[PDB]
Design a protein around this ligand. Sequence first.
Ligand code: HEM
Ligand SMILES: *[C@@H]1O[C@H](CO)[C@@H](O[C@@H]2O[C@H](CO)[C@@H](O)[C@H](O)[C@H]2NC(C)=O)[C@H](O)[C@H]1NC(C)=O
Ligand SMILES: *[C@@H]1O[C@H](CO)[C@@H](O[C@@H]2O[C@H](CO)[C@@H](O)[C@H](O)[C@H]2NC(C)=O)[C@H](O)[C@H]1NC(C)=O
Ligand SMILES: *[C@H]1O[C@H](CO)[C@@H](O)[C@H](O)[C@@H]1O[C@H]1O[C@H](CO)[C@@H](O)[C@H](O)[C@@H]1O
Ligand SMILES: *[C@@H]1O[C@H](CO)[C@@H](O)[C@H](O)[C@H]1NC(C)=O
Ligand SMILES: *[C@H]1O[C@H](CO)[C@@H](O)[C@H](O)[C@@H]1O
Ligand SMILES: *[C@H]1O[C@H](CO)[C@@H](O)[C@H](O)[C@@H]1O
Ligand SMILES: *[C@H]1O[C@H](CO)[C@@H](O)[C@H](O)[C@@H]1O
Ligand SMILES: *[C@H]1O[C@H](CO)[C@@H](O)[C@H](O)[C@@H]1O
Ligand SMILES: *[C@H]1O[C@H](CO)[C@@H](O)[C@H](O)[C@@H]1O
Ligand SMILES: *[C@H]1O[C@H](CO)[C@@H](O)[C@H](O)[C@@H]1O
Ligand SMILES: *[C@H]1O[C@H](CO)[C@@H](O)[C@H](O)[C@@H]1O
Ligand SMILES: *[C@H]1O[C@H](CO)[C@@H](O)[C@H](O)[C@@H]1O
Ligand SMILES: *[C@H]1O[C@H](CO)[C@@H](O)[C@H](O)[C@@H]1O
Ligand SMILES: *[C@H]1O[C@H](CO)[C@@H](O)[C@H](O)[C@@H]1O
Ligand SMILES: *[C@H]1O[C@H](CO)[C@@H](O)[C@H](O)[C@@H]1O
Ligand SMILES: *[C@H]1O[C@H](CO)[C@@H](O)[C@H](O)[C@@H]1O
Ligand SMILES: [Mn+2]
Length: 299
Amino acid sequence: QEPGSGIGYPYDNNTLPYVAPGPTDSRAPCPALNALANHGYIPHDGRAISRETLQNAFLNHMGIANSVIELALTNAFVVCEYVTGSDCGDSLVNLTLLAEPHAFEHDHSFSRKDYKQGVANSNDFIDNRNFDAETFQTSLDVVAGKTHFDYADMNEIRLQRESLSNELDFPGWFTESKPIQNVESGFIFALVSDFNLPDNDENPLVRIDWWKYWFTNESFPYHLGWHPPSPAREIEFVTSASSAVLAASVTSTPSSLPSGAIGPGAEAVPLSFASTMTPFLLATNAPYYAQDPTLGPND
Ligand code: HEM
Ligand SMILES: *[C@@H]1O[C@H](CO)[C@@H](O[C@@H]2O[C@H](CO)[C@@H](O)[C@H](O)[C@H]2NC(C)=O)[C@H](O)[C@H]1NC(C)=O
Ligand SMILES: *[C@@H]1O[C@H](CO)[C@@H](O[C@@H]2O[C@H](CO)[C@@H](O)[C@H](O)[C@H]2NC(C)=O)[C@H](O)[C@H]1NC(C)=O
Ligand SMILES: *[C@H]1O[C@H](CO)[C@@H](O)[C@H](O)[C@@H]1O[C@H]1O[C@H](CO)[C@@H](O)[C@H](O)[C@@H]1O
Ligand SMILES: *[C@@H]1O[C@H](CO)[C@@H](O)[C@H](O)[C@H]1NC(C)=O
Ligand SMILES: *[C@H]1O[C@H](CO)[C@@H](O)[C@H](O)[C@@H]1O
Ligand SMILES: *[C@H]1O[C@H](CO)[C@@H](O)[C@H](O)[C@@H]1O
Ligand SMILES: *[C@H]1O[C@H](CO)[C@@H](O)[C@H](O)[C@@H]1O
Ligand SMILES: *[C@H]1O[C@H](CO)[C@@H](O)[C@H](O)[C@@H]1O
Ligand SMILES: *[C@H]1O[C@H](CO)[C@@H](O)[C@H](O)[C@@H]1O
Ligand SMILES: *[C@H]1O[C@H](CO)[C@@H](O)[C@H](O)[C@@H]1O
Ligand SMILES: *[C@H]1O[C@H](CO)[C@@H](O)[C@H](O)[C@@H]1O
Ligand SMILES: *[C@H]1O[C@H](CO)[C@@H](O)[C@H](O)[C@@H]1O
Ligand SMILES: *[C@H]1O[C@H](CO)[C@@H](O)[C@H](O)[C@@H]1O
Ligand SMILES: *[C@H]1O[C@H](CO)[C@@H](O)[C@H](O)[C@@H]1O
Ligand SMILES: *[C@H]1O[C@H](CO)[C@@H](O)[C@H](O)[C@@H]1O
Ligand SMILES: *[C@H]1O[C@H](CO)[C@@H](O)[C@H](O)[C@@H]1O
Ligand SMILES: [Mn+2]
């Protein structure tokens, strides 16, 4: 928000306004990075981003501590080197390369289509990077009519998304990614679980309106009473939430789940790519921004 608005106070005392990305700006498949770039907490053009810039942006403007993004930072730079063909050092070339498929970006996302979702031919690919309202609706439908949801609900959400993607993706494309997705499940609980409820750290409940605002708008739901978590969320909360999602009992089992979908997931570890492997072509679409309505500087 505008610095003088005081909208983030006393949780964030140095805010910057929302600015929609222009056609030439680089955006990510990540709603968090996109919100940060939209505010200029990382570069608005989404290019040339250092680890510390990311660490500070997450800590000071989203209440996400450094520990939470340690592996994500490692993996971002691994993917940068893979996509560009050379070491990116401490300047992430852009946000868009993070949408390299079957890498950090993965199938059965909550709010993005898959790289080969619904394509008529095998060489074809689509926008697996920008927010897709329809896909996100498929996630929200699982918790229709509710204001909050828990770990068991999130487990049902990710299962529905796995089922849908496995059915709709070009044959042979779909590749399950429980470890990465469920870190991201933990991230959702970390950012938009309802810290105003008395037992948030034991049984955190996601506020659906906060989640929808963050994902659809790629900006922060201050207008709905959100603020950065204080103290900042740490990695233990995230991986604990990730484990709890996967441990939750399934009351409705969708068809066409990949083998082993139900049950615990592997711990996320650093990505690695063969020096011989050429990266998949990145989707080239202009960055998404909200238009129904468009956002002002304080939204
Ligand atoms: C340097 C730090 C980060 C990097 C490089 C990063 C990168 C990515 C990438 C490549 C994806 C796409 C995965 C896919 O859905 O196919 C993603 C998704 C996602 N990220 Fe980030 N991320 C970071 C930090 C965070 C943080 C701190 C949060 C929230 C606390 C967050 C929230 C999410 C969520 C919820 C998704 C899933 C979106 C969906 O499934 O539609 N990310 N991130
Ligand atoms: C995206 O953000 C816009 C702008 O903040 C949201 O629309 C506003 O929502 C606030 C409460 O958050 C209301 O007080 C305003 O009346 C709304 N303004 C306008 C212009 O409609 C919008 O709801 C957000 N989208 C989602 C899905 O959360
Ligand atoms: C983000 O960076 C990536 C990596 O450099 C860009 O993707 C490459 O773009 C060049 C054109 O300049 C192509 O020759 C390569 O084929 C692309 N690589 C892949 C794997 O697709 C990407 O264009 C950049 N995006 C933005 C919006 O800045
Ligand atoms: C990205 O750009 C490529 C070359 O410009 C195209 O071959 C791709 O199909 C893809 O195009 C899509 O996104 C761009 C926005 O940059 C639009 O100009 C196209 O209409 C298309 O949606
Ligand atoms: C914001 O400023 C107020 C008043 O000085 C202070 O009490 C609070 O700790 C500040 N918040 C942060 C995150 O520094
Ligand atoms: C989230 O974190 C837990 C614990 O590391 C994993 O089991 C899960 O697969 C996901 O990565
Ligand atoms: C989540 O899981 C990680 C290991 O993947 C732990 O280090 C953390 O304490 C939490 O239980
Ligand atoms: C790990 O931490 C999460 C979030 O605080 C809890 O919900 C879970 O029960 C475990 O203690
Ligand atoms: C990971 O952690 C969660 C939360 O403590 C457990 O529910 C799960 O069984 C796994 O050990
Ligand atoms: C775990 O428990 C649930 C109820 O919470 C059952 O519906 C499911 O079959 C599983 O045993
Ligand atoms: C069991 O409850 C789950 C939520 O955990 C629903 O998704 C499902 O429809 C069934 O009622
Ligand atoms: C039970 O509920 C789940 C989640 O909503 C569905 O994916 C499944 O098909 C069944 O309707
Ligand atoms: C749907 O069915 C699966 C087995 O196919 C169970 O694991 C789940 O608990 C739900 O009843
Ligand atoms: C597809 O499969 C699921 C369980 O695997 C069923 O619940 C459903 O009725 C359909 O046959
Ligand atoms: C389906 O296949 C996979 C092998 O990747 C197993 O992990 C699973 O238990 C099931 O047999
Ligand atoms: C990570 O692991 C891969 C295995 O494919 C290697 O190719 C790479 O050089 C790195 O050691
Ligand atoms: C997005 O742009 C539209 C232009 O009609 C405005 O209505 C809105 O305030 C926002 O700036
Ligand atoms: Mn994806």
